[PDB]
Amino acid sequence: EIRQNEKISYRIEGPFFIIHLMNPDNLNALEGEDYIYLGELLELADRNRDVYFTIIQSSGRFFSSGADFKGIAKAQNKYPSETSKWVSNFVARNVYVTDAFIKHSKVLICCLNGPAIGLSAALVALCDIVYSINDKVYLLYPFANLGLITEGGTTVSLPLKFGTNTTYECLMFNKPFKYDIMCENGFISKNFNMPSSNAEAFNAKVLEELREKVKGLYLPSCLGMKKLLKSNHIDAFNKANSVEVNESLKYWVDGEPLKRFRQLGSKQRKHRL
Amino acid sequence: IRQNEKISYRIEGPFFIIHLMNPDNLNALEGEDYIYLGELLELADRNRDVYFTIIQSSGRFFSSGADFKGIAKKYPSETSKWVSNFVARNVYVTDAFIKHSKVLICCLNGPAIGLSAALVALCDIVYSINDKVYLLYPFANLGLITEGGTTVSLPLKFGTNTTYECLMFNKPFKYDIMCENGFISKNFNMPSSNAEAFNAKVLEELREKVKGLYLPSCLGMKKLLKSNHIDAFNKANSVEVNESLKYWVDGEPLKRFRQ
Amino acid sequence: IRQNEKISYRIEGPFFIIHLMNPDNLNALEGEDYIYLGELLELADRNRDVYFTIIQSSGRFFSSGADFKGIAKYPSETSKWVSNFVARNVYVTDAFIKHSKVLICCLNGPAIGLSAALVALCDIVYSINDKVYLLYPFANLGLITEGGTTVSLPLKFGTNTTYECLMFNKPFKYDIMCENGFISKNFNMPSSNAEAFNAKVLEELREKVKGLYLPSCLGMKKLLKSNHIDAFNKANSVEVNESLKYWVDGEPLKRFRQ
Amino acid sequence: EIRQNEKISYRIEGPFFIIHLMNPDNLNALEGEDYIYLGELLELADRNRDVYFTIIQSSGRFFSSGADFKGIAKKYPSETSKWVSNFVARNVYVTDAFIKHSKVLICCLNGPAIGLSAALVALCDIVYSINDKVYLLYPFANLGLITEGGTTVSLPLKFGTNTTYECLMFNKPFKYDIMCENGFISKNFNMPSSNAEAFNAKVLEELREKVKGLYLPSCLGMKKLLKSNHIDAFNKANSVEVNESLKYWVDGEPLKRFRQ
Amino acid sequence: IRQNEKISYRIEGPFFIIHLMNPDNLNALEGEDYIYLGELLELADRNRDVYFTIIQSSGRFFSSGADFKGIAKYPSETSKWVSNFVARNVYVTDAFIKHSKVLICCLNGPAIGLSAALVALCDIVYSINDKVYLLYPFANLGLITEGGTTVSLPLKFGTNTTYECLMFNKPFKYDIMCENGFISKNFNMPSSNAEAFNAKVLEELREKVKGLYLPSCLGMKKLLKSNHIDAFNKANSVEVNESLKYWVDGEPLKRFRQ
Amino acid sequence: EIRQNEKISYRIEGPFFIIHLMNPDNLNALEGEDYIYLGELLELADRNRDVYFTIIQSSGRFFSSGADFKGIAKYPSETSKWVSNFVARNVYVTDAFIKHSKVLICCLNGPAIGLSAALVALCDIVYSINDKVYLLYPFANLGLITEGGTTVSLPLKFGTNTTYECLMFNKPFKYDIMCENGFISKNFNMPSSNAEAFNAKVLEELREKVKGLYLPSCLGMKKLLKSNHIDAFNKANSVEVNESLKYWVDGEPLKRFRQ
C-alpha cells in the first residue's frame, strides 16, 4: 500500500488508523523524508472510508525531538545556489506536511508520551485532541535561539490555543509551553498520570479508553461536525503556511542558523584526558 | 403578540423578561415555540425603552431541547418535509438570537440541552443558580451535527480542543469547564429547587447594577462588539441548517429516537 | 426522486440536463418547484459520472419568477412566512451555491425574480439571441434582494450598475451583459424555437469537452469556488431573514392584489 | 530630534527604548498632546534600527489615570469641528501608532490603568505586574462614551467575550484574577507598590538577562508574523470607534457628567 | 446647522439636495468645508423622510479638491498635521462610507483630489457630457491615496487601470469610466449651463421614483453595503495615518510653493 | 551576489531594474531552476533602494511557452519526488511575485502560456507589442489544475464567467477579452519581429513618464493597494501547490505529455 519506514509504522483497527513513531533511541527525531512519509500516511488515512480517527502515537521518553539536525555542520544535490538548495530541502517538506495536517478530514488525536520540539510540537498543536501520559510533558519552539521563525502554522495555532501574551512571552524569549500553561488553556483533554518509563501501556490504555468512548455514537455525525468546525480557521492556516515557508527562507539563506549550528558543535576541551 | 401557554413575557423599566413556564415537561420546546421566541426577541428589539433582554426558566432544567415527541408525532417528499419543519425554525431562531441589539442575559436554573443550550451559548451574560448546571450537545448520539451557531460559539467560548472532546464523544460542558473559560459571570449558589427566588435575585442585582450608567452607551458598545464575529455567525447559521438536512432525510435521527 | 409535471431531467454521459417544461405559464415556479430544483441539483451532485449540470427551459421566457397565485394553517403570520418563504429560499440558494459540478444556464428568454437570481449563480451562461434580459423587481414589489444577488450582481455587473438597476427597477439588458462578459456565447437564433437552441448548445458542449481531463475541471472549479463562498453564505443567511419583515408587513401581498 | 515633554521622558539602552511617564503627582493623566507625543516616541523607536524592545514604564501609585478630564473641558465653527479636532485625531493617531509598532512592546504596570491608557496597555505584547493589586478600568458607560483605543477587538480577544460584556456594560474593572485566568500578566514581581523605581529596574535587569543568546532579528520576524493575525480587525475597529464616539461627544453627556 | 457661504442644502420630498455654490474659485474646498459636508450627510441620514442624497455643483469644475492656498499654535509638525489633515479626512471619509441613504453625484465637470474620492465613493453618478474626468495627482504632490481610494478605485475601475493611472499621474477619463459602467447616464448638455443639468437630473429622478417602495431601496442598500464596508473603514484609518509621514516630511509643502 | 544564467539576464538603469528573458529559439521555456532564478532576481530588485520599477521583458515571438516539459519528463517515492520538484519551485516563485514591493511591469512581446502566463497576470502593469498577444492556461488539457495564483488573479482581472469558460474548456484569453477588461495599459502596435525595438520604446516612454513624479509616493501607494487581495493570494498559492501535487502523483500529466 505504501513503502516501509524503519522509523514510522501504522495499522488499522476498526475505525482507528494508528500511527506509531518507533525510533526511541534517537528521541524520534525526523528527517524531511520522514515528514513526507507522515504526510503520505495522513493521506492514506484520509482516503479510507472505514477510518474515522487518526491516532499518532510515539515511543520512549520523548514524543519527538524535532527535525533531525544530525550532520548539518559537516561540510562534505549540488544545487546552483543556496536559495535553490534551501527551497528544495526546507520549503517543500514544511509546506507539504503542514498542509497535510491542516486539511485532514478525520479526527486527529495526539498521545503525548513526552516532550515535543520544533516542527513536531507544531504538528502536535495542529491535532484536534491531545492526551498526555503525565504532567512532565511540554512543547518547545526554539526558533529565536537558532535564528529562525515560526513553523508548521504555529503563527495561527499557538495564539489560538494558548493566548497572545503567553505566545509572545514563550516565543520572543525561547521558553517552553509547560504543562500548567497547557492546563490553564484546556490544551490537554485527559492526563492519564502513568509512569514515564512505559509508553506502550499508555498507548494501549488510550486505545482502550477510545474504544470505550465510541460505543453507540454515529461516526458520520462526528465527521460532519469536524467538517463544520474546521471552517473557522482554515483560511488563516493556509495563508500562514504559505507566508511562513517563504519567510524562513531568508533566514536560512542569510546563514545565521548554520553559523549557530556550527558553533554549537565546537566545544572541544583544551586539555584532553 | 399572540398568547403562548409555555412562554410568557413582561416589561419592567428597561428590562424585557422572557419566562419559560413549562417545568413539568422540563421546558421542552417545539418548532413553533422557537418561532415564538424569535418573535419575542423582535418585540424586545423594537421597543425603544428596553435595553436588556432577560431569558428565565422554571423547574429543574433550563430546557431539555427540541421536543422530539412533536417531531415523530402532506408533503411531496422527505426533503420538503424537513425543509419546512426543521430548516426554517432553526434559521429564524438562530438569526433572531444573532442579530439582537439589546443586551441578552440568560439565567441558568439548570441544565440546557440541544438547541436551547445553543441559544444559551449565544447570550452575552450567563448567570447560574449553582454549580450543578451544564450544557449538553448530543449531536453525535442523535445522528445530527452542530446547530444554533455552535460551530462558531463553542470554540469561541470554550476552546477548540475542549469543543472537539465534548462534541465528538457526546460529553457535557460542565461547570468546571465553564469557570475555566469564564462562561458564567456570577454563580448565585442557591438550591436548585427554588428557581423563582433565583430569578428574583438576578432581577434585583441587575436593577441595582444599572444605577448611574448611560444605557445608550451600553447599546453602542454592544453594537461595536457584535461586529467582531457577526459574519462567522451568519455563515455558520446558513451552512449548519443546510448540512444537517441530509441526516434528517437519511432517517438516522428518527430511527434513533424511536428507542 | 419523485415526478414533477413542470420539471424533468435526464443524464447523457457527463451531462445532467434539467429541463423546465411549462412554457404556457412562462415556467413560473412555485415553492415546491424550487425545492424540486434543489433536490435535482443534490441528485446530480452525488453521482460520479456527472461533470456538467445544464439547466434548460422552454417557450419565450426562461422563467417568470415565483408563482404568486400559490402564495396567496399557522399560529401567526411570522410562522406562515417562515415556513412558506424562508425555508425554500435558503434551501435552493444553498443548493445552487454549494454545487460542485459545472453549472451551465441556457437563456432562451427573459428571467425574472428568484429565477434570474439563480441564473446569476450559474458558472456559464449562453443566450439564444440579443433580446434576453434579467429583471429583479424588488423595488416594485416591496421586497429586497433574493437568491444571493447581494453578492452575485455587484460581482458580475459592477456596483454602480447594480445600484442603478436595482433601486429604480430596471432590467439588466443584453448590452450590459456584454459590457461585463456575463454571456459566454450568443447563439443568435430566433426566439421562437428554444428546442433547437438547446440541441445546438448540447452539440457544442459535446464537441468542446472531448480530449479534456474532467476531474481537472472539477478541481479547478473547487478552487475557484473558494473565492466568494463565505460572502455567498452570509448573504443567503441575512437575505432570507431580513426579507421577512416585509412579508409580515403586508406590502408584497397588497401590491400583488392590484 | 524630538522636543521635550515635562511629563514623559525617554532613553535608549542597547536594544531597549525605555519610555517613562514621569508625572506621578497627577496620577500620570495624559492630555491630547501627551498622547500625540507618545505616538511620536513610538515612531522614533520604530525607526531606530538598533532598538528591538520598547519598554513603557511609569511612576507613582498609578500607571495612568486616563485622559486628562480637566484639560478636556475647554475658534471652531461648530461642536462637530471642535470634537473632530480635539478627540478623533489624537485617538486615531495614538491607536494606529500602537497597532503598527514593529518592535516588541512591553508594559510595566506599577498600578491601575484607566481609560485610553488601559486601552494602550491592552495593546502591548507583554505585561508585567508590580504586585497583585493592579487592575484595568474602562468606565465608558459611566462617562457617556463607548469603546476606544482598540478595545473592541483587544478586550474580547484577551479576556473573553462574556467577561468583556460583564465588565464593560456595568463599569466594572478587569481585576488581577481575571488577568491570571486569561494569562494576561507574563510575570508578577510581587514588590511593594510604594516603589515603582525598583520595579522598573528589576524588570530591566531581567530583560537584560533574558536576551543573551537570542537572535533578535528572528524575534522581530516572529512578531511581524504574529501581528498579521488580527491587524485588519484592529484597523477596522479604529475608524469605527473614533467616528462613533463623535455622536456621544457632541450631545454633551460626557461633559455634563464630568461637570457634575 | 450653521450656514456656509460655499455649500447650501434643501429638502424636496424624498430628496436631500446639497449644492456647492463657489464656481468662481472652481469649487475648491477647505477642511472646514469637508467637515460641513460630513455634517450635511449626517443631517440627511438622520431624518426619516429622505431616501436620496444628491450632491450638485456649479461652474466648469465639480470641485478642484482641497484648497492648498488655505493650508499653506502647535508644539510639533506632527501635532499640526494630525489636527489639520488627519481628522478632517477620516471624518469626511467615514461620513461618506456609512451613509444609509442612496448617494447620487451630479458631475458637471472635472473633480480633483479628495473631491474625486468622494465622487468615486457615491452610489450613482451622472455626467453633463463626455468631457468629465477624475484626477488623483498624489504622485505629483508627494502624497498617497486618500478618501478610501485604495478600495474604491480598483473596485470600480480595475487593478491594472488604477495602477497605470495612479503611478503616473493620469486622469480617469470618460472612456475609462464608460468601460467600467461608472456613469449611469450621460445627459450630453453644454458645459456652460450646469443649472439646467441639475434641474434635468432632478426632474428625471422625480420621474424614475414613481410607483416604487422606497423602504425596499433602503433595505437593499443596507444589504449591498456589507460587501466591502470592512475593507473601506479599514483602509480609511490606514490611509490617513500613512499620509502623515509624507506631510511631516515636507514634500507636499515644498512642491506646492512652485 | 547572484550566479550567471544563460536564459535570463538583468541590468539596472536609474530607478529601473530590467530583467530580460533571452532564449528566443526555445520560445523562452523555463525550467524549475529558471523560476527560482527569477524569484532571486525579484528579491535582488526588492532589496535595492534605488530601484522603483521592475521591468520584465522577453525576446522572440513568444513571451514564454511555460514550464519546460523535457526537464519534467534518488527519491523514496513519487510523492517525495514531485514535492521536491514542483511544489517548492511553484510556491517560491509565486510568493516572490506576490510580495514584491516595486512596481512590476511586464512587456508582452507575444503569447504567454502556463506558469509564465500566471506571472504575467500577477504583474501590476502590462504592455502589448500588438493586438495578437494572448494568454493560455491549458490546465484541463494537461490533467492539472490552476497554478501560479491564477485562482485569485484570473477572476479578479477578467471576470468569473469568462474565467470559467476559458479554464474549463482550455481556451485562451485573447486580446479582445484583455481590452474589454482593461488588462493592457497600452498597445504599441509594433511588428511581431521588432521585439527589441518594442522593449526600447517601452523603456523610453516609461523614462519620459516618470519625470517630475515623487517615487516614494508611488511605492507607498503600491504598498496600500497591495493589501486588497494579499491574504487571498497567499491562501490560493498554499492550497494550489498541494492540490496539484496529487494530480502529479496520479500520473496523468506525464502520461499526456508522452503522447
Side-chain angles (χ1 to χ4, degrees), chain A residues 100-132:
Chain A
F101 263 74
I102 283 171
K103 69 176 173 195
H104 201 53
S105 61
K106 308 296 184 290
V107 190
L108 271 170
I109 302 187
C110 198
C111 307
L112 264 187
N113 62 294
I117 305 181
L119 191 59
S120 296
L123 301 178
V124 164
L126 279 184
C127 282
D128 306 329
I129 304 175
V130 170
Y131 300 116
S132 61

Short mmCIF file of all heavy atoms in Angstrom, two decimals, chain A residues 100-132:
data_model
loop_
_atom_site.label_atom_id
_atom_site.label_comp_id
_atom_site.label_asym_id
_atom_site.label_seq_id
_atom_site.Cartn_x
_atom_site.Cartn_y
_atom_site.Cartn_z
N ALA A 100 -0.84 18.87 4.82
CA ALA A 100 -1.41 17.56 5.07
C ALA A 100 -2.06 17.49 6.44
O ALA A 100 -3.10 16.84 6.62
CB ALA A 100 -0.35 16.47 4.92
N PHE A 101 -1.46 18.15 7.44
CA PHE A 101 -2.09 18.17 8.75
C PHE A 101 -3.27 19.14 8.81
O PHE A 101 -4.23 18.89 9.55
CB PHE A 101 -1.06 18.54 9.82
CG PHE A 101 -0.47 17.35 10.52
CD1 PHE A 101 0.45 16.54 9.89
CD2 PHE A 101 -0.85 17.05 11.82
CE1 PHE A 101 0.99 15.45 10.53
CE2 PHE A 101 -0.32 15.96 12.47
CZ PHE A 101 0.61 15.16 11.82
N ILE A 102 -3.22 20.23 8.04
CA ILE A 102 -4.28 21.24 8.11
C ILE A 102 -5.59 20.69 7.57
O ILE A 102 -6.66 20.90 8.16
CB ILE A 102 -3.84 22.51 7.36
CG1 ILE A 102 -2.85 23.32 8.20
CG2 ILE A 102 -5.04 23.37 7.02
CD1 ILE A 102 -2.22 24.47 7.45
N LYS A 103 -5.55 19.98 6.44
CA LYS A 103 -6.75 19.61 5.71
C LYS A 103 -7.27 18.22 6.05
O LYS A 103 -8.20 17.75 5.39
CB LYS A 103 -6.49 19.69 4.21
CG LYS A 103 -5.53 18.64 3.69
CD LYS A 103 -5.39 18.71 2.19
CE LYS A 103 -4.31 17.77 1.70
NZ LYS A 103 -3.91 18.09 0.30
N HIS A 104 -6.70 17.55 7.05
CA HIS A 104 -7.14 16.21 7.41
C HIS A 104 -8.62 16.21 7.79
O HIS A 104 -9.06 17.00 8.63
CB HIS A 104 -6.30 15.67 8.56
CG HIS A 104 -6.31 14.18 8.67
ND1 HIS A 104 -6.02 13.35 7.61
CD2 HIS A 104 -6.58 13.36 9.72
CE1 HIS A 104 -6.11 12.09 8.00
NE2 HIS A 104 -6.45 12.07 9.28
N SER A 105 -9.39 15.32 7.17
CA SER A 105 -10.83 15.26 7.39
C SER A 105 -11.22 14.29 8.49
O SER A 105 -12.39 14.27 8.89
CB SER A 105 -11.56 14.89 6.10
OG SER A 105 -11.16 13.61 5.64
N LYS A 106 -10.29 13.48 8.98
CA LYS A 106 -10.56 12.59 10.10
C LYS A 106 -10.16 13.26 11.41
O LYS A 106 -9.44 14.26 11.42
CB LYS A 106 -9.81 11.27 9.92
CG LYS A 106 -10.05 10.61 8.57
CD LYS A 106 -11.50 10.19 8.40
CE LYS A 106 -11.69 9.45 7.09
NZ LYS A 106 -11.54 10.35 5.93
N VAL A 107 -10.64 12.71 12.51
CA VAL A 107 -10.33 13.27 13.83
C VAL A 107 -8.90 12.90 14.19
O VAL A 107 -8.55 11.71 14.25
CB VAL A 107 -11.33 12.76 14.89
CG1 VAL A 107 -11.15 13.54 16.18
CG2 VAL A 107 -12.75 12.89 14.38
N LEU A 108 -8.07 13.91 14.44
CA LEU A 108 -6.67 13.73 14.77
C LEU A 108 -6.50 13.74 16.29
O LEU A 108 -6.85 14.73 16.94
CB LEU A 108 -5.81 14.82 14.14
CG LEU A 108 -5.26 14.59 12.73
CD1 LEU A 108 -4.66 15.88 12.19
CD2 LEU A 108 -4.22 13.49 12.75
N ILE A 109 -5.96 12.66 16.84
CA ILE A 109 -5.72 12.53 18.27
C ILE A 109 -4.24 12.30 18.49
O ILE A 109 -3.64 11.41 17.87
CB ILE A 109 -6.56 11.39 18.88
CG1 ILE A 109 -8.05 11.63 18.63
CG2 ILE A 109 -6.27 11.26 20.37
CD1 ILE A 109 -8.96 10.66 19.33
N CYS A 110 -3.64 13.10 19.37
CA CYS A 110 -2.23 13.00 19.71
C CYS A 110 -2.07 12.41 21.10
O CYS A 110 -2.75 12.84 22.04
CB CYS A 110 -1.55 14.37 19.64
SG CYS A 110 0.25 14.31 19.55
N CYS A 111 -1.19 11.43 21.22
CA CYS A 111 -0.86 10.81 22.50
C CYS A 111 0.55 11.24 22.89
O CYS A 111 1.53 10.76 22.31
CB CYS A 111 -0.96 9.29 22.41
SG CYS A 111 -2.54 8.68 21.79
N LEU A 112 0.64 12.15 23.86
CA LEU A 112 1.92 12.69 24.30
C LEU A 112 2.54 11.74 25.31
O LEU A 112 2.05 11.60 26.44
CB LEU A 112 1.74 14.08 24.91
CG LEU A 112 1.98 15.31 24.04
CD1 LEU A 112 1.90 16.56 24.89
CD2 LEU A 112 3.31 15.23 23.31
N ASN A 113 3.63 11.08 24.92
CA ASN A 113 4.42 10.26 25.83
C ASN A 113 5.62 11.00 26.39
O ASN A 113 6.41 10.41 27.14
CB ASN A 113 4.88 8.98 25.12
CG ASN A 113 5.78 9.27 23.94
OD1 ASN A 113 5.34 9.85 22.95
ND2 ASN A 113 7.04 8.88 24.04
N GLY A 114 5.78 12.27 26.04
CA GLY A 114 6.91 13.06 26.47
C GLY A 114 6.92 14.40 25.78
O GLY A 114 5.93 14.83 25.18
N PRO A 115 8.05 15.10 25.84
CA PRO A 115 8.12 16.44 25.24
C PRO A 115 8.18 16.37 23.72
O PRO A 115 8.54 15.36 23.11
CB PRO A 115 9.42 17.01 25.81
CG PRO A 115 9.74 16.15 26.99
CD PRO A 115 9.24 14.80 26.65
N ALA A 116 7.80 17.49 23.10
CA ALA A 116 7.86 17.66 21.66
C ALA A 116 8.54 18.99 21.35
O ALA A 116 8.34 19.97 22.07
CB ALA A 116 6.47 17.62 21.03
N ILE A 117 9.35 19.00 20.30
CA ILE A 117 10.19 20.15 19.97
C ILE A 117 10.06 20.47 18.49
O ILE A 117 9.95 19.56 17.66
CB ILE A 117 11.67 19.90 20.34
CG1 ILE A 117 11.78 19.50 21.82
CG2 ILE A 117 12.52 21.12 20.08
CD1 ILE A 117 13.19 19.24 22.27
N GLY A 118 10.03 21.76 18.16
CA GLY A 118 10.17 22.17 16.77
C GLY A 118 8.93 21.88 15.95
O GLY A 118 7.80 22.13 16.37
N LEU A 119 9.15 21.34 14.74
CA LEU A 119 8.04 21.04 13.84
C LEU A 119 7.16 19.92 14.39
O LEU A 119 5.97 19.86 14.07
CB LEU A 119 8.58 20.66 12.46
CG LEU A 119 7.59 20.54 11.31
CD1 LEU A 119 6.85 21.85 11.09
CD2 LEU A 119 8.29 20.12 10.03
N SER A 120 7.72 19.05 15.23
CA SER A 120 6.91 18.02 15.86
C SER A 120 5.91 18.62 16.85
O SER A 120 4.75 18.22 16.88
CB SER A 120 7.81 17.00 16.56
OG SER A 120 8.62 16.32 15.62
N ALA A 121 6.36 19.58 17.66
CA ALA A 121 5.43 20.30 18.53
C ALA A 121 4.43 21.11 17.72
O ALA A 121 3.29 21.30 18.15
CB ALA A 121 6.20 21.19 19.49
N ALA A 122 4.84 21.59 16.54
CA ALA A 122 3.93 22.32 15.67
C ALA A 122 2.83 21.41 15.14
O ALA A 122 1.68 21.83 15.01
CB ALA A 122 4.70 22.95 14.52
N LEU A 123 3.17 20.16 14.84
CA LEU A 123 2.14 19.21 14.40
C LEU A 123 1.30 18.73 15.56
O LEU A 123 0.11 18.42 15.38
CB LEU A 123 2.79 18.03 13.68
CG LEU A 123 3.61 18.36 12.43
CD1 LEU A 123 4.23 17.10 11.86
CD2 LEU A 123 2.77 19.08 11.39
N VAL A 124 1.88 18.64 16.76
CA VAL A 124 1.10 18.34 17.96
C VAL A 124 0.05 19.41 18.18
O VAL A 124 -1.11 19.12 18.49
CB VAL A 124 2.02 18.19 19.18
CG1 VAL A 124 1.22 18.26 20.47
CG2 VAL A 124 2.79 16.88 19.11
N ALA A 125 0.43 20.68 18.00
CA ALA A 125 -0.51 21.78 18.17
C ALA A 125 -1.53 21.87 17.04
O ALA A 125 -2.43 22.71 17.11
CB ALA A 125 0.24 23.10 18.30
N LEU A 126 -1.41 21.04 16.00
CA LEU A 126 -2.37 21.01 14.91
C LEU A 126 -3.39 19.88 15.06
O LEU A 126 -4.27 19.75 14.20
CB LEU A 126 -1.66 20.87 13.57
CG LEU A 126 -1.08 22.14 12.93
CD1 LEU A 126 -0.49 21.83 11.57
CD2 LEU A 126 -2.15 23.21 12.83
N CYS A 127 -3.28 19.06 16.10
CA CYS A 127 -4.21 17.97 16.32
C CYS A 127 -5.46 18.48 17.03
O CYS A 127 -5.46 19.53 17.67
CB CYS A 127 -3.56 16.86 17.14
SG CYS A 127 -2.43 15.80 16.21
N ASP A 128 -6.54 17.70 16.90
CA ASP A 128 -7.83 18.09 17.46
C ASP A 128 -7.95 17.74 18.94
O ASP A 128 -8.53 18.52 19.71
CB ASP A 128 -8.96 17.42 16.68
CG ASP A 128 -8.89 17.70 15.20
OD1 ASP A 128 -8.41 18.79 14.82
OD2 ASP A 128 -9.31 16.83 14.41
N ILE A 129 -7.43 16.59 19.35
CA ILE A 129 -7.47 16.15 20.74
C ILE A 129 -6.07 15.69 21.13
O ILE A 129 -5.39 15.02 20.35
CB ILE A 129 -8.50 15.02 20.95
CG1 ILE A 129 -9.88 15.46 20.47
CG2 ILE A 129 -8.55 14.60 22.41
CD1 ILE A 129 -10.93 14.38 20.52
N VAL A 130 -5.65 16.06 22.33
CA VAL A 130 -4.32 15.73 22.84
C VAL A 130 -4.47 15.06 24.20
O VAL A 130 -5.15 15.59 25.08
CB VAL A 130 -3.42 16.97 22.94
CG1 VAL A 130 -2.15 16.65 23.70
CG2 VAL A 130 -3.10 17.51 21.56
N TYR A 131 -3.84 13.90 24.36
CA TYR A 131 -3.72 13.23 25.65
C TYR A 131 -2.26 13.15 26.05
O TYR A 131 -1.38 12.96 25.20
CB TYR A 131 -4.32 11.81 25.60
CG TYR A 131 -5.79 11.77 25.26
CD1 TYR A 131 -6.23 11.17 24.09
CD2 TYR A 131 -6.74 12.34 26.10
CE1 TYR A 131 -7.57 11.13 23.77
CE2 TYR A 131 -8.08 12.30 25.79
CZ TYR A 131 -8.49 11.70 24.62
OH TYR A 131 -9.83 11.66 24.31
N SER A 132 -2.00 13.29 27.34
CA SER A 132 -0.65 13.26 27.88
C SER A 132 -0.50 12.08 28.83
O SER A 132 -1.47 11.62 29.44
CB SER A 132 -0.32 14.56 28.61
OG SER A 132 -1.18 14.77 29.71
#
